[PDB]
Design a protein around this nucleic acid. Sequence first.
DNA 1: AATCTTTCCCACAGTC
DNA 2: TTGACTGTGGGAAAGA
Lengths: 254, 431, 95
Amino acid sequence: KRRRQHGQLWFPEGFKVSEVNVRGPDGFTPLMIASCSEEDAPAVISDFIYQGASLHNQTDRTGETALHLAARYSRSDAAKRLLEASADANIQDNMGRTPLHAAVSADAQGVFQILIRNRATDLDARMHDGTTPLILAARLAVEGMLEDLINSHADVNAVDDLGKSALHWAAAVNNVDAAVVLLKNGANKDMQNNREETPLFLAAREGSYETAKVLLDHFANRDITDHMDRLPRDIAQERMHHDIVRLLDEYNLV
Amino acid sequence: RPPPKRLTREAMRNYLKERGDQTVLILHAKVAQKSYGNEKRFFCPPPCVYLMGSGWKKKKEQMERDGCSEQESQPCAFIGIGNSDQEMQQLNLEGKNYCTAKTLYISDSDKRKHFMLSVKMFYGNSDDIGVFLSKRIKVISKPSKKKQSLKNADLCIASGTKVALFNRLRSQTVSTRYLHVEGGNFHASSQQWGAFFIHLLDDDESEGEEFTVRDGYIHYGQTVKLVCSVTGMALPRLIIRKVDKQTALLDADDPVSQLHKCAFYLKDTERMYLCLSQERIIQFQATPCPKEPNKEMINDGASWTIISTDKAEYTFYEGMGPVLAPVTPVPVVESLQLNGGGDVAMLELTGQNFTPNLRVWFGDVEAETMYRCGESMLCVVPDISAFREGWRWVRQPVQVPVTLVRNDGIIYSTSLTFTYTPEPGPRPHCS
Amino acid sequence: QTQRIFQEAVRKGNTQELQSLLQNMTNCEFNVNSFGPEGQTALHQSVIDGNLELVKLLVKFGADIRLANRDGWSALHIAAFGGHQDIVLYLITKA
DNA sequence: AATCTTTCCCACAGTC
DNA sequence: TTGACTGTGGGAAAGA
């Protein structure tokens, strides 16, 4: 109840009836640039974190902070002393990215292993489009980065704003290593999104042979209608994926 | 047969100059009343296909510059439901910029809960344009006219959604006159209709054009404001009231479900309700109120039936000449994210209807692109040297456009602009 | 005229003796903080090189520390990006 | 029960 | 003119 969407009036006949931390360009702070880069740069970041340094400073354009820059550029040494300096790990940028999201997207192995071992770090963080880091790890098919979140007790049965699950994206990109570990750690085999679609449907749409094979190994129900009563065989024959149809006609019946 | 043609640099510069977007627009309601047996209850608001965009005229020139008649160069359209081969009805665009499909029906033989309209388009000279689909439409048996509630309902009207209003004169099919806005004038045209935002307003507000909006689902007896989506010409505050049997009912706290015969009341305006006199809209008296203070006898021409409506849009352009492959997969980009920095500066694209035969273009620079899935694609940001030759590193922010290009050269337009982030230090990640 | 293009060409040699000699006699043109070819003063590119004696002599001879270069960054940003810890010491001490 | 969704069933007011 | 149809709305009937 704050915004307003104006227009322009119009009436029929007769209306009388109414009766030292230098701002610099953008939003970059000296500690941010220190975390972005015998060069004792880790020691430089350490000395920067002390004294009168403001850790929580967001970018004017991208909205990111110092920890976000340390996660994107894969500077794990900076993020170490940042977290030791009582920094925040649940700061949303202009796009909703938490530092964990930037660490997973940029394939920052060290920052990832440091963030999962932190207590206050959120693992079910939801961005603007609600995508969770556990979903990003399967979307980018980064090896090893997925199971470390599940062993850290992350929500595998999570949904985004649309309602897609981690297994949905694992079936879309055909990341067999993702879908296998998800289903082994208690992923819902027949979860329906807001559009009433199963992971097998998305696997058959984009030609995911191996992921559909794994879902059939884990006894996924082939006969689930979508919002238009289309079975995965229907979309497979529509997209002309004959081998997927043969898998839906032979492999692991009853 | 013509092979695929990669989009060149100067063709992209020409696109940046001219920008002849051949946009395709589809307005259609979100709810469809189902027909039983052999009946044929048509969609009260006919699906309206617009063809906005200047580049369309350019398409008229080039084809006519290659020996095509005015009848041959005119795009014929077909409308149909996808899952059934019950023949696509024909749409003609002789000298019009749009058209409405008013002879569509959905039989009970199709037990689908939702569906979506399919539009085939091709020119008279057999050159295919392609198949464009609209947003989903929900099937309904009968409007929820009873005293519904908010607990699990979702077919009511949210403040800020595109709606439409129509009329039915004494159960006559041809008497349907739709609400439209054109030339700064509110018309009751039986051939056109626009998208109307409906905003719930507090009982205490201002005169107009500036107001405190209100959230929540819309019920009867409240104060609403109607605003056309394109023109912007708004109406003064109105109060929606459900009517039945030429009698308006005001004392009602029920939610406004779909396909409802509502009435609009002006504050301190006696009983003057917004009615239609044949061709134009006029305020009508509706005096009798003898049975109950909450029962006003309103004359015919007043059963304004309300229905929500969505909007599908697909914009593109032919940057490498017309190709044989149809442009039926139109990618849309809802948002653009980041993936790394420095030498591994990558971008994640979240959208819909992506195709593996697509490549991103940072302005006029071709970048390496990977196809993750039909709604997500990764790309590598090129070096700043491609934009500024002498620059070894990003000095000041540079705003370039981001577009999508198919293998054949069909350039798709986006609304997002990439911005190179300025870097304090010179050489990054020297190795 | 020719004396103005001396510092912008002599600072690219990393010679402290020549700097101390040409600055002991000082100069009259009062070039002082002088934006170079890349718009970076001798202070900024001296921080880029990473030698504490040059930057200290510059700060000694009236070189303002809290000035933004042509692109908009101060002297602290380049010192933080380069990793030289000894430069930020004197950049913070001068405040 | 008091609501609700889903199928038929049938009389206006007009066009064919 | 009379004869065979026709989209639209409303109430009875049928489940839930």
